[PDB]
DNA sequence: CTGTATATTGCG
DNA sequence: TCGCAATAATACA
Ligand SMILES: O=C(O)CCC(=O)C(=O)O
């Protein structure tokens with residue numbers, strides 16, 4: 001069964017792919033195998049200022065591709081067994097295909113990601129995004145674009161969702177046209193979390 | 204009276 | 216501790 005997350009312009013689906021034992025093993029292999037970007041490849045530019053990202057990132061996928069957000073371009077690394085196994089399984093469950101994965105690792109509840117839409121030029125038009133989570137459960141927040149700021153034109157409610165160990169969140173079109181998402185700071189969370197967002201990228 | 208868009212600071 | 220409006224400076228269209 002899928003929990004359907006629906007609101008005006010919001011269309012997402014949530015389910016648990018893996019039980020505890022399997023999700024533990026996958027997490028441990030991710031921790032062991034994934035090579036994260038450092039230094040110059042972990043700095044972004046937002047509002048005219050450069051910052052080191054408050055988390056760790058890695059990109060895997062087919063050769064040739066490119067992934068640019070916030071002034072930072074990330075070349076994908078060749079697929080490794082554990083990412084292919086997760087990719088293929090998501091594909092078998094959803095029917096959707098993927099040639100790329102972005103990995104965000106939050107070492108604890110102080111690591112986080114800011115509010116944004118996934119609306120890249122390099123993202124295939126109307127292609128779903130598969131977000132698979134491992135480790136600590138973290139709250140994932142959807143805010144509507146017209147409901148943000150000083151004076152909002154719309155009073156659409158915020159949508160909050162705990163992403164569990166071994167879960168899958170599907171973000172279908174047009175979720176990313178109208179809704180920003182983020183993983184806010186959760187100061188009580190002491191354990192790491194690894195998130196995989198599988199995507200379809202144009203060459 | 205009025206373009207649009209975007210990590211931490213500075214509040215509450 | 217949590218939420219979030221303001222905004223570091225441009226870069227557009
Ligand atoms: O950490 C997550 O659950 C999602 C991360 C994300 O949205 C991104 O990396 O663009």
Ligand SMILES: [Mn+2]
Pocket residue numbers: 116117118181
């Ligand atoms: Mn995202």
